[model samples]
Target: HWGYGKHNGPEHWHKDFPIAKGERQSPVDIDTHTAKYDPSLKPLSVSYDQATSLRILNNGHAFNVEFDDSQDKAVLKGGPLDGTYRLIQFHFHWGSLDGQGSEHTVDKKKYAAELHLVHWNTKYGDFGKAVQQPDGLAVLGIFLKVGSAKPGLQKVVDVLDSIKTKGKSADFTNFDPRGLLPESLDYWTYPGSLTTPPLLECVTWIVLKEPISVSSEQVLKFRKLNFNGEGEPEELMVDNWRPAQPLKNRQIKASFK
Candidate 1:
């Protein structure tokens, strides 16, 4: 299986998934100075009602919080998005240790972690169908800096113990994810692919300029997770992030100057 280890990690991913090295691959280092400010870009509109949050699980790669996208309970609109996108699930990627975990970095500086709120274009029906088409996903990437403890994020941290190993699920509901976002919606927009394997070129990347906070201690809680299943030898889930790829022939536009 594709993972973040040296043997089968990002470096080896291109062998199975050729698109891993394709143009528009994600997790690209954002050179803020080089990023152009577009007056035409509008602010992003994200709406997520508390009732939409449904379940939590460990998919071996990362921990995920599922949302009920059956209706328009959670949706993303505006800012480089021509179509409506419904929230499907949200997850994170981090490093084995602190200081560098986020897939996308601004000004060539990486954060402790990154939050990915995955949404699929309703026009394509569902995630499976959306993922196959270009312009079918709108993923909001929020950076997680290791500073003060994020009280809002703690709600999720408190439950990390429930699914300690891979392929485990627990009923998690009534949690609103807006608290994890920064005050400003200022973002860098680009066309990119999924950071993981299959590396589909379907995401309209909206990476926020501001970052939320999570104490170093809180981040350590994530390493307690196991990438391997319960019965297998413990393979601590750390550094579950892909490195930055080349930003070839692509221009990143900023929503704010």
Candidate 2:
């Protein structure tokens, strides 16, 4: 029931969801110099079954690419995780312009956008059950910068025209998510919660240091999306990201030197 606007935004979420004020809340600012470099951290291993991608949906909040996680069709291992985690869905968070949109910032700098590939731990059985545990989820955060047009993201942007209105969706598959990632896997890890509501403090955040490139034109396409329904007055979908929360006593670990 939460929507991002001046009246009912992140600030007001705590009124309805008490966990919004929890200690492990997400989208924290990663101070690079303050993060501890962990030599024992292993390189991340990500494997995805392209055919597992089911469809794309305009979930009102953002566009979500759903995947079949019935089995480990797409699983992530190594790095800061204790066991393998299965990919369930992936989505984006952007602003009306290129200067600021990302939920997580680094050294007080914001990016053009952010992509979240959400996964759940295998030990928990399902995503719903996993959210209740201490180690329930692992979210891969990739920042997007405005530069060259990203060819890999062309397909995703093309489909946005069809799902411009809220609640719209279309069939989408055979798109490999690995193509969207940057060259390096160097990252910062910390214990955090879902950036959105229910705000479960179960996500192990893995934020890449290198940002991928996208064109300004492509970034504007996301703004064309509507937050309201087809019959309602047009409300551009932008600035849906939650502001960075406080990082109290949590140590951010780095995977690379």
Candidate 3:
């Protein structure tokens, strides 16, 4: 069922997505005060080829810039990750205003937005079969704060105007996603779900502790996007995020001291 509504929001999602109430549900608030420090965790190795970017589009629920993962050009390894995971796409969960937008919070504190770089385990072959396994996917989450301009995102903002409505898209190639990440990659790792519909419990979440900054005007580009397709009612796509789920049997580990 389509989500993010009064009747089918996170609270009511349990009916359609039965596992929405799973103990491993995502967007869990990270209690930094007590997050365990893992001394054995290795620093993550992220390498993205500028040629991997394929297209940027509005998938109605959220926007993602898909990549050409036909080859092993962009892969994530090390850290809490078990094996190599190929990059599939990158998307975000954001709020209506600057006050709150991030999915996972730090000590109950929210950011303006959150970026998820979705990847699949190469051992599983395809993302389709991987989601069925326990450690099938790895999503690297980066928080976005409202501050100075993030020039790294300008290439993206330049095209958001073209893909303004749902199903609308534009050619986006030769783009490198690495430039969008923050300087420090110290992160909190945990096991969680997709945070949205089909909340599968297969993702090993690596959410960075440091937040990247972007001008308030740059964030307006996302809010200006339409939830509906062209020639439709023109509902704005605000608050395209989910609430933090209960961390029933989970433990959050931080790579930093």
Candidate 4:
């Protein structure tokens, strides 16, 4: 409900939000298309082994997945992502900054929020080192819309009972994020930055066309999240999305033949 707290509003995220030279950030509008694009832009095959070791980090604003730094075996080769990239950290973009969050936009039409499966090429070393390279990162952007209850997402949302407090997180099992992806792998690919603060510029963004559905009630449930588990009152976090940034001589290409 508040806008001035850490990770609450965008205005306050200057220090970490993409102040670097080649960091890849998220939440951009996929506009201005072209026929010519790197055909190598395809979805990375994040295997069971990789997903098993995935670490969920609660970085105040969203639930992020921090790679173990050892799972460098899951990088997608063709499809604009040509190097060995490791799953780094992943976070969500929503509305009201809590419930319905979306990072990417289409023709100014916003969905509920977007979930970014963020990865970085390990060619340089770790995420910190990769952030400085031109082809350092590749993000698979999935769109989330508030509609019917998504059985897949419910597995995640149900865990709220345990980690109800801010900065609170727990280890989860049998959670397959791959099940959350849209049916189609055909996507719009381009060079973009990271969405959260510290918005990086070294990224190969793969924005999916189809959106996964979640129930309207589920959407509202996100807005009801308490800032903290034990002390904070349930706040309506219904608008946690970011505005579109500069396209800056960028060309967005799709693989929908």
Indicate whether candidate 1 or candidate 4 has the larger lDDT.
1
Where does the lowest 10-residue lDDT sum fall in candidate 4? 17-26
- Per-residue CA lDDT of candidate 3, range 1-257, in tens? 56577865788888888999898999899999889999989879897863389899998878899998777889999999878999999998888999999999999999999999999999999999989888999999999999999998888888988998999888999888987899998999999988777889999999999999998998998898888899999878878888998999889999998
Output the TM-score of candidate 3.
Answer: 0.97
* Predicted candidate 1 versus true structure: per-residue lDDT over 58-79, tens digit per residue: 9999999999989888899999
Each prediction's Cα lDDT score?
A: 0.91, 0.92, 0.89, 0.64
Q: Taking the tens digit of each residue's C-alpha lDDT, what string does model 2 give over 1-257?
A: 68888788999999988999888898999999999999989889888754388899999999999999998889988999989999999999999888899999999899999999999999999999999987999999999999999999999998999999899999998878987899998999999999888788999999999999999988999999999889999999999899999998799999987
lDDT of each residue in 1-257, candidate 4, tens digit only: 33434565665565454352332344567763444444555544554355543445444456664545566644545565676666655666677633335667876678887878777787788878887776888788888887666787776676655555567777765466666777887677777775555566777887888989887766655555445445667644346566666566667787765
The 10 consecutive residues of candidate 3 with the worst lDDT sum are: 1-10
lDDT of 3: 0.89
TM-score: model 4 vs. ground truth: 0.79
Candidate 1: misplaced stretches above 4 Å? none
> Candidate 4, after superposition: displacement of residue 17 in Å?
6.2
